[PDB]
Amino acid sequence: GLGYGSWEIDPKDLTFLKELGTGQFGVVKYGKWRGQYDVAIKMIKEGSMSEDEFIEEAKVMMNLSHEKLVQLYGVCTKQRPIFIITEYMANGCLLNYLREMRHRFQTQQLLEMCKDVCEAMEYLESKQFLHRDLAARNCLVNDQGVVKVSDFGLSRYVLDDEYTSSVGSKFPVRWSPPEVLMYSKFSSKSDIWAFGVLMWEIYSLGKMPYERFTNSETAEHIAQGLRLYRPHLASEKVYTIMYSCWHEKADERPTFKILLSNILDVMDEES
Numbered sequence: 184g185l186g187y188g189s190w191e192i193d194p195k196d197l198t199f200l201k202e203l204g205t206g207q208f209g210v211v212k213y214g215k216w217r218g219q220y221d222v223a224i225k226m227i228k229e230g231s232m233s234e235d236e237f238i239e240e241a242k243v244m245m246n247l248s249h250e251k252l253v254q255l256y257g258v259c260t261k262q263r264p265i266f267i268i269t270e271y272m273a274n275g276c277l278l279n280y281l282r283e284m285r286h287r288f289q290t291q292q293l294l295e296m297c298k299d300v301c302e303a304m305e306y307l308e309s310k311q312f313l314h315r316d317l318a319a320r321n322c323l324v325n326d327q328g329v330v331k332v333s334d335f336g337l338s339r340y341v342l343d344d345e346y347t348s349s350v351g352s353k354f355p356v357r358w359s360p361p362e363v364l365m366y367s368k369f370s371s372k373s374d375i376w377a378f379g380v381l382m383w384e385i386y387s388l389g390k391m392p393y394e395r396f397t398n399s400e401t402a403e404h405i406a407q408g409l410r411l412y413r414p415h416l417a418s419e420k421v422y423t424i425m426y427s428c429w430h431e432k433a434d435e436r437p438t439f440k441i442l443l444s445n446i447l448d449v450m451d452e453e454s
C-alpha cells in the first residue's frame with residue numbers, strides 16, 4: 184500500500200508465533216503474514232549488515248523464483264532491526280537435520296537432497312547469481328523433507344571482517360577452492376567446489392569437512408592437491424560426482440547443469 188515499495192512488507196501484517204533461535208545474521212521467528220500465510224522473519228541486528236546495499240540487492244533477490252530456492256517475500260526496513268521475510272521451512276537447517284540419527288536415511292534420500300540443491304544452484308547459475316557461501320548450514324528443509332538453498336549472496340553484506348576475508352577466523356575455509364584461499368578468486372567454479380563439499384556433508388550425515396584439521400591445516404592440505412575422501416554411504420559413482428567438483432583447475436570443474444545430469448544418471452542407476 185501507500186508508503187511501501189514492491190520489495191517492502193508492512194511489519195503490521197505480521198503475527199509472531201514461535202522463536203526459532205539465532206541463525207546466521209540474527210534472531211529468527213516463525214509467524215503469519217496477513218493472518219494466514221506462513222513466514223519466517225529474520226531480524227538483522229544493528230551494526231551487523233551493510234543495510235542500504237542489502238536493501239538494493241533484496242529487490243533483485245525478490246525476482247529470483249525456483250521451487251528449490253528459499254523465497255524472499257520482502258523486507259521491513261522502516262524500523263530497526265530490519266526484517267527479512269521468507270518462506271517458512273519447518274524442519275530447519277539441513278546440517279542439524281543430517282545430524283539427527285533418528286531419520287535413518289536411505290542413500291536415495293541423501294541423493295535427492297543433493298539433487299534439490301543442484302537444481303537451485305543450476306537456477307542461480309542461469310541467472311549469473313553466485314551463492315558465495317554454499318554449505319549445509321545454509322540450506323533449509325521444509326515439512327515435506329525438500330531441501331532448499333538459503334542465505335544466497337548474503338555474505339556480501341556482512342560487516343564483521345572475521346567472516347569476510349580468507350584471513351578471517353570465521354571464513355568458510357573448508358568450503359573454498361584453492362584459488363579462493365590463495366588469491367580470493369570467486370566465480371561460478373567456487374560455488375561448484377562448495378557444492379561438492381556439501382555433497383560430502385550430506386553423505387557424511389553432517390560431519391565437519393576435514394574434521395580432524397584446523398582451518399589452517401585444511402588450507403595447506405587443499406593447496407598441496409589433497410582432498411576429502413569418500414564417505415562410507417557414497418557409492419563410487421556418487422563419490423566421482425562430488426570429487427569432480429574439486430579439480431585443482433577451476434575450468435575443469437563441471438557446471439551445475441552437468442552435475443544435475445550426473446545426479447539424475449546415478450538416481451536412475453541406483454533406483
Ligand SMILES: C=CC(=O)N1CCC[C@@H](n2nc(-c3ccc(Oc4ccccc4)cc3)c3c(N)ncnc32)C1
Pocket residue numbers: 203204205206207211223224225253254255267268269270271272273274275276279323333334335337
Ligand atoms: C539450527 C536451528 C535451525 O534450524 N536454524 C537456526 C535458527 C533459524 C532457522 N531458520 N532460519 C531461517 C531463515 C530465514 C530467513 C532467511 O533469510 C534469507 C536471506 C536471504 C536469502 C534467503 C533467505 C534465512 C534463513 C528459517 C526459515 N526460513 N524457516 C525456518 N527456520 C529457519 C534455522
